[PDB]
Design an enzyme around this catalytic site. Structure first.
Site, PDB file in Angstrom:
ATOM      1  N   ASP A  12       1.036  -1.339   0.188  1.00  0.00           N
ATOM      2  CA  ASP A  12      -0.036   0.023  -0.079  1.00  0.00           C
ATOM      3  C   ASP A  12       0.846   1.208   0.037  1.00  0.00           C
ATOM      4  O   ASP A  12       1.401   1.951   1.160  1.00  0.00           O
ATOM      5  CB  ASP A  12      -0.881   0.072   1.198  1.00  0.00           C
ATOM      6  CG  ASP A  12      -1.977   1.291   1.345  1.00  0.00           C
ATOM      7  OD1 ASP A  12      -2.074   1.985   0.009  1.00  0.00           O
ATOM      8  OD2 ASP A  12      -2.388   1.765   2.351  1.00  0.00           O
TER       9      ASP A  12
ATOM     10  N   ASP B 107      -1.626   5.713  -5.371  1.00  0.00           N
ATOM     11  CA  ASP B 107      -2.083   4.645  -4.123  1.00  0.00           C
ATOM     12  C   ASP B 107      -2.598   3.445  -4.572  1.00  0.00           C
ATOM     13  O   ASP B 107      -3.481   3.059  -4.826  1.00  0.00           O
ATOM     14  CB  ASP B 107      -3.281   5.535  -3.448  1.00  0.00           C
ATOM     15  CG  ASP B 107      -3.654   4.645  -2.143  1.00  0.00           C
ATOM     16  OD1 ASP B 107      -3.519   3.557  -2.183  1.00  0.00           O
ATOM     17  OD2 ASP B 107      -4.736   5.193  -1.514  1.00  0.00           O
TER      18      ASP B 107
HETATM   19  C1  LIG Z   1      -3.501   6.983   8.216  1.00  0.00           C
HETATM   20  C2  LIG Z   1      -3.308   7.451   6.900  1.00  0.00           C
HETATM   21  O1  LIG Z   1      -3.998   6.862   5.738  1.00  0.00           O
HETATM   22  C3  LIG Z   1      -5.244   7.067   5.421  1.00  0.00           C
HETATM   23  O2  LIG Z   1      -6.028   7.920   6.312  1.00  0.00           O
HETATM   24  C4  LIG Z   1      -5.981   6.478   4.390  1.00  0.00           C
HETATM   25  C5  LIG Z   1      -7.479   6.376   4.292  1.00  0.00           C
HETATM   26  N1  LIG Z   1      -7.402   5.706   2.988  1.00  0.00           N
HETATM   27  N2  LIG Z   1      -6.205   5.352   2.716  1.00  0.00           N
HETATM   28  C6  LIG Z   1      -6.016   4.708   1.284  1.00  0.00           C
HETATM   29  C7  LIG Z   1      -5.482   3.352   1.784  1.00  0.00           C
HETATM   30  O3  LIG Z   1      -4.601   2.903   0.555  1.00  0.00           O
HETATM   31  C8  LIG Z   1      -6.559   2.356   2.344  1.00  0.00           C
HETATM   32  C9  LIG Z   1      -5.863   0.887   2.731  1.00  0.00           C
HETATM   33  C10 LIG Z   1      -6.862  -0.334   2.968  1.00  0.00           C
HETATM   34  C11 LIG Z   1      -6.202  -1.355   2.328  1.00  0.00           C
HETATM   35  C12 LIG Z   1      -6.986  -2.804   2.454  1.00  0.00           C
HETATM   36  C13 LIG Z   1      -8.265  -2.712   2.951  1.00  0.00           C
HETATM   37  C14 LIG Z   1      -8.719  -1.538   3.468  1.00  0.00           C
HETATM   38  C15 LIG Z   1      -8.097  -0.198   3.424  1.00  0.00           C
HETATM   39  N3  LIG Z   1      -7.385   1.806   1.044  1.00  0.00           N
HETATM   40  C16 LIG Z   1      -8.756   2.322   0.987  1.00  0.00           C
HETATM   41  O4  LIG Z   1      -9.277   3.023   1.828  1.00  0.00           O
HETATM   42  C17 LIG Z   1      -9.476   1.516   0.027  1.00  0.00           C
HETATM   43  C18 LIG Z   1      -9.443   0.269  -0.400  1.00  0.00           C
HETATM   44  C19 LIG Z   1     -10.319  -0.537  -1.408  1.00  0.00           C
HETATM   45  C20 LIG Z   1      -9.910  -1.625  -1.769  1.00  0.00           C
HETATM   46  O5  LIG Z   1     -11.012  -2.571  -2.093  1.00  0.00           O
HETATM   47  N4  LIG Z   1      -8.714  -2.370  -1.778  1.00  0.00           N
HETATM   48  C21 LIG Z   1      -8.260  -3.668  -2.345  1.00  0.00           C
HETATM   49  C22 LIG Z   1      -7.371  -4.175  -1.087  1.00  0.00           C
HETATM   50  C23 LIG Z   1      -7.763  -3.593  -3.392  1.00  0.00           C
HETATM   51  C24 LIG Z   1      -8.234  -4.370  -4.644  1.00  0.00           C
HETATM   52  C25 LIG Z   1      -7.856  -4.492  -5.818  1.00  0.00           C
HETATM   53  C26 LIG Z   1      -6.644  -3.881  -6.010  1.00  0.00           C
HETATM   54  F1  LIG Z   1      -6.069  -3.999  -7.533  1.00  0.00           F
HETATM   55  C27 LIG Z   1      -5.986  -3.049  -5.023  1.00  0.00           C
HETATM   56  C28 LIG Z   1      -6.524  -2.790  -3.796  1.00  0.00           C
HETATM   57  C29 LIG Z   1     -11.227   0.391  -2.161  1.00  0.00           C
HETATM   58  C30 LIG Z   1     -11.373   1.608  -1.770  1.00  0.00           C
HETATM   59  N5  LIG Z   1     -12.360   2.501  -2.328  1.00  0.00           N
HETATM   60  C31 LIG Z   1     -13.079   3.501  -1.551  1.00  0.00           C
HETATM   61  S1  LIG Z   1     -12.879   2.253  -3.905  1.00  0.00           S
HETATM   62  C32 LIG Z   1     -14.155   1.059  -4.219  1.00  0.00           C
HETATM   63  O6  LIG Z   1     -11.444   1.777  -4.676  1.00  0.00           O
HETATM   64  O7  LIG Z   1     -13.289   3.616  -4.535  1.00  0.00           O
HETATM   65  C33 LIG Z   1     -10.501   2.285  -0.776  1.00  0.00           C
HETATM   66  C34 LIG Z   1      -5.187   5.774   3.532  1.00  0.00           C
END
Ligand SMILES: CCOC(=O)c1cnn(C[C@H](O)[C@H](Cc2ccccc2)NC(=O)c2cc(C(=O)N[C@H](C)c3ccc(F)cc3)cc(N(C)S(C)(=O)=O)c2)c1
EC number: 3.4.23.46
Length: 375
Positions: free
Chosen positions: A37, A221
């Site tokens: 990530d 990201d």
């Molecule tokens: C603390 C300082 O940082 C922060 O505050 C902060 C806040 N947010 N972040 C962004 C981080 O990167 C988090 C980490 C995380 C990782 C895993 C699980 C939960 C969160 N990602 C998400 O938040 C997120 C994850 C997915 C998803 O499904 N991911 C899977 C693993 C995936 C599937 C296929 C792939 F090719 C690549 C990835 C969908 C969404 N969507 C909203 S969407 C539908 O794309 O628009 C959003 C950081």
């Protein structure tokens, strides 16, 4: 074989639910699958039983584990977890040939974070200390690695869509791309923040003021699936993409991600959908370059004789996010030592006989320093 050969093909993914790499923790060794990530800065692992986990970290069996006596809590856009801080020894078996002592959070409870069938059990946050929890004195994994060892301050990523790929630590591997690499400056070190200066849909400029593209930030990201856009930008782009694919109509819910459409195996009409280009700020005054993706990148398969798709561009209220939809077109270099990010056409991207993903330049763009948002 070039000299980074043993790192090629060290990533997996199952059904497009996150790309992961193997890491080995503690003594004697425990090996676990860890999500990669670039949108966060904490290293954390599951450490208690859970119906979606096949294995987890057992601190009592590690003789080198040290307790920091402090709780930690982390909320994301999707999901959250809580746990306990400590340090232990950490290696990457298909990565660089070193071992370091790193901060690790042990996850004991969580809500909508782990994913059924994904095969991963923890997350490796690759961004900077400014966004770590509980605050910026908690040193991230990549900082520990550069400070303790000879390894150069640089890594790169090739995600191969439909699930494998490579993560090269300390250098670049020239068999993973074609053509040249083009670089954009990192605006500020917290997320991997960049400046977008123009957007086109099938060669046609969208014509919004460029301050709307970066409000309130734009970042690269690898833990988010979609390309996510600010409200006013999302609305104008969908209007233009519909105008350009009008030889077949689709229901309104499709463009919102609420309905899927399925074609007979082998027959999807890629050619009725347009290409999409983003222009980025370059390394010289008034110069930019452009990256272009295909419908094979922004329409994602959902896993008989039928191929079903979901539309993977969506609305955001916290700025532009270039997720896996952008990264699966390209080899991407995170060059932290010279404060820049490099893009080249990927040797593994998905395409057809009529069109390919592209990286081109240079173009002339005036006043690019107006585009960025200030607090
Ligand atoms: C603390 C300082 O940082 C922060 O505050 C902060 C806040 N947010 N972040 C962004 C981080 O990167 C988090 C980490 C995380 C990782 C895993 C699980 C939960 C969160 N990602 C998400 O938040 C997120 C994850 C997915 C998803 O499904 N991911 C899977 C693993 C995936 C599937 C296929 C792939 F090719 C690549 C990835 C969908 C969404 N969507 C909203 S969407 C539908 O794309 O628009 C959003 C950081």
């Amino acid at each position: 074989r070039g000299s980074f050969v043993e790192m090629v093909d060290n990533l997996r993914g199952k059904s497009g639910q996150g790309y992961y790499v193997e890491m080995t923790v503690g003594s004697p060794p425990q090996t676990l699958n860890i999500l990669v990530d670039t949108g966060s800065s904490n290293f954390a692992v599951g450490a208690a039983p859970h119906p979606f986990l096949h294995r987890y970290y057992q601190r009592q069996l590690s003789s080198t584990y040290r307790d920091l006596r402090k709780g930690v809590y982390v909320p994301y856009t999707q999901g959250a977890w809580a746990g306990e801080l400590g340090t232990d020894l950490v290696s990457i078996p298909h990565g660089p040939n070193v071992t370091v002592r790193a901060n690790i959070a042990a996850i004991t409870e969580s809500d909508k974070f782990f994913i059924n069938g994904s095969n991963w059990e923890g997350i490796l946050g690759l961004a900077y200390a400014e966004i770590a929890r509980p605050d910026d004195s908690l040193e991230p994994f990549f900082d520990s690695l550069v400070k303790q060892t000879h390894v150069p301050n640089l890594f790169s990523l090739q995600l191969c869509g439909a699930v494998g790929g490579s993560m090269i630590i300390g250098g670049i591997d020239h068999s993973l791309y074609t053509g040249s690499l083009w670089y954009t400056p990192i605006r500020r070190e917290w997320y991997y923040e960049v400046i977008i200066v123009r957007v086109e849909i099938n060669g046609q400029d969208l014509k919004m003021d460029c301050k709307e593209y970066n409000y309130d930030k734009s970042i690269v990201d690898s833990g988010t699936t979609n390309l996510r856009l600010p409200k006013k930008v999302f609305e104008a782009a969908v209007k233009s993409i519909k105008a350009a694919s009008s030889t077949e109509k689709f229901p309104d819910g499709f463009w919102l991600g609420e309905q899927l459409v399925c074609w007979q195996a082998g027959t999807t009409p890629w050619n009725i959908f347009p290409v999409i280009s983003l222009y980025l700020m370059g390394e010289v005054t008034n110069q930019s370059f452009r990256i272009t993706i295909l419908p094979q990148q922004y329409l994602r398969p959902v896993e008989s004789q039928d191929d079903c798709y979901k539309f993977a561009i969506s609305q955001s209220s916290t700025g532009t996010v270039m997720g896996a939809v952008i990264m699966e077109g390209f080899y991407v270099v995170f060059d932290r030592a010279r404060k820049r990010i490099g893009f080249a056409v990927s040797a593994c991207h998905v395409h057809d006989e009529f069109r390919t993903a592209a990286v081109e330049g240079p173009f002339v763009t005036l006043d690019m320093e107006d585009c960025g948002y200030n607090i």
